[PDB]
Design an enzyme around this catalytic site. Structure first.
Site, PDB file in Angstrom:
ATOM      1  N   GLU A  77       0.861  -1.131  -0.037  1.00  0.00           N
ATOM      2  CA  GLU A  77      -0.046   0.086   0.151  1.00  0.00           C
ATOM      3  C   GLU A  77       0.806   1.282  -0.094  1.00  0.00           C
ATOM      4  O   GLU A  77       1.904   1.233   0.710  1.00  0.00           O
ATOM      5  CB  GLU A  77      -0.853   0.300   1.233  1.00  0.00           C
ATOM      6  CG  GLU A  77      -2.050   0.958   1.279  1.00  0.00           C
ATOM      7  CD  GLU A  77      -3.070   1.024   2.206  1.00  0.00           C
ATOM      8  OE1 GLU A  77      -3.955   1.941   2.641  1.00  0.00           O
ATOM      9  OE2 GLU A  77      -3.032  -0.167   3.056  1.00  0.00           O
ATOM     10  N   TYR A  78       0.569   2.039  -0.853  1.00  0.00           N
ATOM     11  CA  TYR A  78       1.286   3.362  -0.737  1.00  0.00           C
ATOM     12  C   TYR A  78       0.428   4.612  -0.345  1.00  0.00           C
ATOM     13  O   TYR A  78      -0.827   4.550  -0.596  1.00  0.00           O
ATOM     14  CB  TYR A  78       1.280   3.921  -2.392  1.00  0.00           C
ATOM     15  CG  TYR A  78       1.294   5.487  -2.706  1.00  0.00           C
ATOM     16  CD1 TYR A  78       2.763   6.171  -2.246  1.00  0.00           C
ATOM     17  CD2 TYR A  78       0.584   6.196  -3.245  1.00  0.00           C
ATOM     18  CE1 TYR A  78       2.956   7.254  -2.541  1.00  0.00           C
ATOM     19  CE2 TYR A  78       0.797   7.647  -3.668  1.00  0.00           C
ATOM     20  CZ  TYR A  78       1.915   8.235  -3.498  1.00  0.00           C
ATOM     21  OH  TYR A  78       2.254   9.570  -3.339  1.00  0.00           O
ATOM     22  N   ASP A 122       7.949  -0.827  19.340  1.00  0.00           N
ATOM     23  CA  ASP A 122       7.963   0.563  19.475  1.00  0.00           C
ATOM     24  C   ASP A 122       7.632   1.006  18.113  1.00  0.00           C
ATOM     25  O   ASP A 122       7.982   0.886  17.048  1.00  0.00           O
ATOM     26  CB  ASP A 122       9.099   1.214  20.008  1.00  0.00           C
ATOM     27  CG  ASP A 122      10.664   0.670  18.929  1.00  0.00           C
ATOM     28  OD1 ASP A 122      11.523   1.328  18.915  1.00  0.00           O
ATOM     29  OD2 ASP A 122      10.317  -0.444  18.591  1.00  0.00           O
ATOM     30  N   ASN A 127       7.332   5.854  11.318  1.00  0.00           N
ATOM     31  CA  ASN A 127       6.714   4.453  10.919  1.00  0.00           C
ATOM     32  C   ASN A 127       5.236   4.606  10.597  1.00  0.00           C
ATOM     33  O   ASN A 127       4.634   3.369  10.508  1.00  0.00           O
ATOM     34  CB  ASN A 127       7.216   3.595  12.029  1.00  0.00           C
ATOM     35  CG  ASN A 127       8.527   3.191  11.898  1.00  0.00           C
ATOM     36  OD1 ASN A 127       9.288   3.510  10.984  1.00  0.00           O
ATOM     37  ND2 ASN A 127       9.006   2.658  13.116  1.00  0.00           N
TER      38      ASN A 127
HETATM   39  O1  LIG Z   1       9.661  -3.295   5.994  1.00  0.00           O
HETATM   40  C1  LIG Z   1       8.831  -2.201   6.437  1.00  0.00           C
HETATM   41  C2  LIG Z   1       9.482  -0.780   6.356  1.00  0.00           C
HETATM   42  C3  LIG Z   1       8.582  -0.011   5.587  1.00  0.00           C
HETATM   43  C4  LIG Z   1       8.661   0.864   4.904  1.00  0.00           C
HETATM   44  C5  LIG Z   1       7.397   1.276   4.354  1.00  0.00           C
HETATM   45  C6  LIG Z   1       6.771   2.334   3.544  1.00  0.00           C
HETATM   46  C7  LIG Z   1       7.416   3.638   3.400  1.00  0.00           C
HETATM   47  C8  LIG Z   1       6.836   4.638   2.680  1.00  0.00           C
HETATM   48  C9  LIG Z   1       5.711   4.260   2.323  1.00  0.00           C
HETATM   49  C10 LIG Z   1       4.926   5.112   1.607  1.00  0.00           C
HETATM   50  C11 LIG Z   1       4.994   6.431   1.425  1.00  0.00           C
HETATM   51  N1  LIG Z   1       4.212   7.355   0.875  1.00  0.00           N
HETATM   52  C12 LIG Z   1       4.559   8.537   0.697  1.00  0.00           C
HETATM   53  C13 LIG Z   1       4.320   9.801   0.283  1.00  0.00           C
HETATM   54  C14 LIG Z   1       5.164  10.941   0.439  1.00  0.00           C
HETATM   55  C15 LIG Z   1       6.430  10.769   1.060  1.00  0.00           C
HETATM   56  C16 LIG Z   1       6.840   9.577   1.463  1.00  0.00           C
HETATM   57  C17 LIG Z   1       6.076   8.453   1.266  1.00  0.00           C
HETATM   58  N2  LIG Z   1       6.193   7.200   1.792  1.00  0.00           N
HETATM   59  N3  LIG Z   1       3.729   4.493   1.186  1.00  0.00           N
HETATM   60  N4  LIG Z   1       3.788   3.273   1.729  1.00  0.00           N
HETATM   61  C18 LIG Z   1       5.013   3.230   2.183  1.00  0.00           C
HETATM   62  C19 LIG Z   1       5.404   2.340   3.096  1.00  0.00           C
HETATM   63  N5  LIG Z   1       6.734   0.300   4.859  1.00  0.00           N
HETATM   64  N6  LIG Z   1       7.414  -0.492   5.398  1.00  0.00           N
HETATM   65  N7  LIG Z   1       7.906  -2.282   6.613  1.00  0.00           N
HETATM   66  C20 LIG Z   1       6.955  -3.462   6.492  1.00  0.00           C
HETATM   67  C21 LIG Z   1       7.745  -4.712   6.401  1.00  0.00           C
HETATM   68  C22 LIG Z   1       6.871  -5.980   6.163  1.00  0.00           C
HETATM   69  C23 LIG Z   1       5.354  -5.861   6.216  1.00  0.00           C
HETATM   70  C24 LIG Z   1       4.889  -4.437   6.229  1.00  0.00           C
HETATM   71  F1  LIG Z   1       3.501  -4.280   6.476  1.00  0.00           F
HETATM   72  C25 LIG Z   1       5.767  -3.497   6.323  1.00  0.00           C
END
Ligand SMILES: O=C(Cc1cc(-c2ccc3c(-c4nc5ccccc5[nH]4)n[nH]c3c2)n[nH]1)Nc1cccc(F)c1
Length: 234
Positions: A77-78, A122, A127
């Site tokens: 998901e974004y 945490d 996050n």
């Molecule tokens: O491994 C990670 C680290 C991580 C980074 C991210 C991450 C980082 C950024 C975004 C974004 C995102 N949207 C943005 C818009 C503007 C600026 C930055 C943005 N980042 N959407 N989804 C994300 C997801 N998720 N998770 N999470 C993880 C791992 C396994 C399963 C799970 F559900 C999460």
């Protein structure tokens, strides 16, 4: 469904340090995020299955995943509105209606997690992400750690909520300290204070979440039905 890199268009980096990219599934044109983890970089310093049994409005969905020789890829998901951390810098601090609403979204997310007996460690503002209607999504180290995790669970999420509320309302965590060791002493002896602006209802809540003896922290339902909470979230 066995996905591959060639299935997605790639755009800019979003994250940083263990690498997530804006992406688009080529056929449906759906925007999402691709986390590219490095296996090698993990034969150094499952669970993607606990994540796929999850469906909650305030947990980041994992749509699937794949791997090649060197890399593991998570299709996520974004969150269009970015990190809560970004918003806190932009805003300085959050109002009570906004804070209380995030606390409710977190505590819902955390009920469900505990109900599928998942327990998160945490939670840090970096996050936490922000959906297209600005609803929150869940996805040193010291500032967020409870006493238990530093000294000599399921109540550690109460502590996290408590640091968070505080951070949301004041724009700083309550144990921020000139050094790693000072923060250890503050957390470990529960030494923090409120700026005068923090209201009575918010002190009571944060006060209760931040007791050193876990078994004196409220239950998630009590947070959910907290008068300051039920008064302020929309
Ligand atoms: O491994 C990670 C680290 C991580 C980074 C991210 C991450 C980082 C950024 C975004 C974004 C995102 N949207 C943005 C818009 C503007 C600026 C930055 C943005 N980042 N959407 N989804 C994300 C997801 N998720 N998770 N999470 C993880 C791992 C396994 C399963 C799970 F559900 C999460």
């Amino acid at each position: 469904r066995q996905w591959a890199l060639e299935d997605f268009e790639i755009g800019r980096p979003l994250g940083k340090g263990k690498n997530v990219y804006l992406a688009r599934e080529k056929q449906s044109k759906f925007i999402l995020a691709l986390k590219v983890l490095f296996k090698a970089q993990l034969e150094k310093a499952r669970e993607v299955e606990i994540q796929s049994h999850l469906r909650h409005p305030n947990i980041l969905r994992l749509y699937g995943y794949f791997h090649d020789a060197t890399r593991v890829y998570l299709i996520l998901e974004y969150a269009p509105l970015g990190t809560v951390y970004r918003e806190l810098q932009k805003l300085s601090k959050f109002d009570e209606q906004r804070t209380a609403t995030y606390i409710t979204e977190l505590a819902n997310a955390l009920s469900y997690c505990h109900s599928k007996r998942v327990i998160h460690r945490d939670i840090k503002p970096e996050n936490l992400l922000l959906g297209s209607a600005g609803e929150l999504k869940i996805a040193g180290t010291l500032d967020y750690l409870p006493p238990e995790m530093i000294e000599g669970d399921e109540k550690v999420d109460l502590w996290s909520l408590g640091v968070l509320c505080y951070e949301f309302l004041v724009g700083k965590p309550p144990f921020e300290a000139n050094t790693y060791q000072e923060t250890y002493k503050r957390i470990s002896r529960v030494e923090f204070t409120f700026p005068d602006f923090v209201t009575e209802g918010a002190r009571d809540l944060i006060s209760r979440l931040l007791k050193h003896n876990p078994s004196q922290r409220p239950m998630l339902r009590e947070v959910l039905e907290h008068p300051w909470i039920t008064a302020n979230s929309s």
